[PDB]
Write a protein that binds this ligand. Structure first.
Ligand SMILES: C[n+]1cn([C@@H]2O[C@H](COP(=O)(O)OP(=O)(O)O)[C@@H](O)[C@H]2O)c2nc(N)[nH]c(=O)c21
Ligand SMILES: [Cl-]
Lengths: 316, 329
């Protein structure tokens, strides 16, 4: 058919994304010299037509379709291996497969996933490389011009909170609750600007978030079921706090050590860093290759750090 | 042994199902003793394709790579520039297995509680809470570590060990594939470094005086692991971390391809802490190190520590923070 025929003509150019968490792979290519994107995703296991009430009686349900097993290794009560399972177009297909063609630049930009590098960012690196970049720098539309006011979940209005206040809105199933609190202060561009003197304010924000969010969802999510965190590097240089259901099943990098830092941890660390706060911290995090800071000095500094630590690397 | 045990598995119930990650856990029995099987679909594959050879990264020439193994396609529907369908792909034990399986047997109640679906709670654990609630539990828990000692002293998984640094003691460690890793796809590379010293049960036991030792472990790991895989992964592409609470009370360091977004909490803030961060934080805590820290983390409601005092203490913390009690109605 049409679909099969188009897939057969697909000429591979490059891999856009490979995600071992979700078992998704996206490929850039061409069909009739026009750009094309194929996305493939492994199917989930099947259950008989909570998860604790599912069943495994039917032919293709659960692990019933195993044709072949092979051990990797074992130890005491733990055994693990690999399996081949019977596939079938109607009852147990192997993967979902989508095609975008002709694909536009916007589609390609959407599906390309960048590579990351662990950097160790010292105070001096921040001052020399990062700080000047931040200064050279839609949030304001939301804060001061009413943009997306229909979507806002909570907003401070009183004169007392003109500076220390904030608003909360969703990020663009209750398990997948994901909100962002954007503060009214304009002098905090990243966690680097948090001083010891800001600690009580952060504690107050943490307490407000947990006092308010549950009531917005009729106490269907509890205050202790919110993973409240910030990012470094953040996606935008105006301080903001991510509020995520602790059970959110969707997420990978956005909640990962190396990117996300718990608000409670920010708070606790400010007891020890002295007056200038996170200005004094050496922060190890994952920086993306597409980020402007990579070529502005982080790459060069990482190679020097590896040399100092006596770590083997491939040269430039 | 493995195959034989899987074949005898009698299903009892589904413990958990995650369609995002394509992971499923099943409770059952083998010889009328409890057993847990966890299954995870494999990821897609790519080519395994001075006088040094660079690995050809993300290519699709080979038989089983990318979408070359498609035997059958079926369109669901299509519209405008979009086509949506399904595929059947050729499976093969050696070159394209369908799913990784883990088996725990005989499984203990602790294992079952761990894998059952449960609520999770962000807890704030103060030094006093550690001393009163957690520390006594650790002492009881230290049978459960039989697998660690098997690797260290009885040759278990010796064939897979990638690095071993041991003179006959307390300074050394070894590195091998973590039970999580299917051993085939480098995007999900996941290794565990197990230390030989036994006096460190968790990060709580790390003092300021342990800092240089941790720096040395970090350096060795990054100096060794990449060369084991022909630099298909670089030293700066390893997310190296520890867990609190860990499942097992023996200091273990998790080494994960940075490209792996992570199953459940294995790399998540609230569970995972970067080794570099452990190292850096020791500069600011006292001599007693993480014993002085208030540590906030995610714990499951079935964990033994929940009813042993963390639940009661979390309620009191919420009151002190002026967080409202949930109305009964
Ligand atoms: C019993 N066992 C557990 N692991 C891994 O050891 C690490 C233990 O680290 P942990 O943080 O205590 O466990 P958790 O992530 O479940 O909380 C985990 O990544 C397990 O996947 C294991 N890895 C190997 N190679 N062999 C084993 O017998 C074994
Ligand atoms: Cl068709």
């Amino acid at each position: 058919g049409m679909f099969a025929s188009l897939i057969k003509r697909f000429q591979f150019v490059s891999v856009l994304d490979s995600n071992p968490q979700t078992k998704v792979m996206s490929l850039l290519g061409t069909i009739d010299n026009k750009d094309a994107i194929i996305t493939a995703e492994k199917t989930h296991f099947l259950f008989d037509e909570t998860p604790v009430l599912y069943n495994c009686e039917n032919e293709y349900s659960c692990i019933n379709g195993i044709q072949e097993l092979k051990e990797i290794t074992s130890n005491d009560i733990y055994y693990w291996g690999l399996s081949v399972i019977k596939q079938d177009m109607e009852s147990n297909p192997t993967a979902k497969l989508n095609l975008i063609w002709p694909a536009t630049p916007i589609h390609i930009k959407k599906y390309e996933q960048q590579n990351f590098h662990l950097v160790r960012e010292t105070p001096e690196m921040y001052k020399r490389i990062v700080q000047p970049y931040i200064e050279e720098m839609w949030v304001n539309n939301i804060l001061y011009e009413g943009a997306e006011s229909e979507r806002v979940v909570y907003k401070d209005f009183s004169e007392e909170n003109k500076d220390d206040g904030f608003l909360i809105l969703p990020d663009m199933n209750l398990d997948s609750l994901y909100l962002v609190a954007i503060v009214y202060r304009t002098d905090i561009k990243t966690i680097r600007d948090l001083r010891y003197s800001d600690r009580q304010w952060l504690i107050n924000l943490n307490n407000k978030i947990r006092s308010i969010v549950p009531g917005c969802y009729n106490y269907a999510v509890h205050p202790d079921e919110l993973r409240i965190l910030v990012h470094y590097q953040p996606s935008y240089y105006h301080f903001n706090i991510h509020i995520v259901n602790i059970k959110h099943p969707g997420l990978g990098n956005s909640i990962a050590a190396g990117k996300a830092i718990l608000l409670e941890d920010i708070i606790e660390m400010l007891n020890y860093l002295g007056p200038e706060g996170y200005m004094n911290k050496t922060i190890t995090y994952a920086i993306g290759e597409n980020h402007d800071l990579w070529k502005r000095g982080l790459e060069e500094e990482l190679t020097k750090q590896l040399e100092r630590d006596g770590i083997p690397k491939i040269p430039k």
